[PDB]
């Protein structure tokens with residue numbers, strides 16, 4: 001039975017990991033966009049077009 | 056259509072014209088001889104690029120803040 005438990009646990013773990021990390025990353029991105037859209041001195045490719053994306 | 060006097064510029068006798076002065080030892084100064092002193096802007100072009108960028112950006116910043 002612990003095989004079933006571990007399978008369910010790690011499936012739920014992977015689901016939570018993917019979902020929560022994607023949501024948190026997108027949320028930080030959106031907050032940054034809100035900070036920069038209201039301050040167009042910063043609404044620039046401030047890190048770089050490829051630098052941030054590559055990282 | 057017009058008499059020869061008007062064309063040649065004189066009725067009877069052609070009058071001598073005083074020639075143009077030259078001012079030896081220096082460049083002529085006329086309305087058309089000014090590019091010797093004033094060329095097209097060539098010294099601060101890259102500064103022009105920078106200042107245009109910064110002007111656009113600062114104007115956009117303050118305009119957006121005012122509008123919001």
Ligand SMILES: CCCCCCCCCCCCO[C@@H]1O[C@H](CO)[C@@H](O[C@H]2O[C@H](CO)[C@@H](O)[C@H](O)[C@H]2O)[C@H](O)[C@H]1O
Pocket residue numbers: 056057061062063064
């Ligand atoms: C064609 C149908 C019938 C109509 C005929 C008449 C048409 C008239 C309109 C054209 C006028 C042209 O006018 C023209 O002006 C110039 C001024 O630069 C005159 O120019 C004249 O005076 C200048 C100085 O002022 C002299 O240095 C020059 O040697 C002499 O030519 C010409 O002599 C005249 O021909």
Ligand SMILES: COCCOCCOCCOc1ccc(C(C)(C)CC(C)(C)C)cc1
Pocket residue numbers: 091092
């Ligand atoms: C608003 O427009 C201003 C109109 O007035 C123009 C002012 O002109 C005065 C220019 O003064 C000088 C005088 C001498 C020179 C020299 C002879 C030094 C230039 C040189 C060495 C390139 C020939 C340059 C500028």
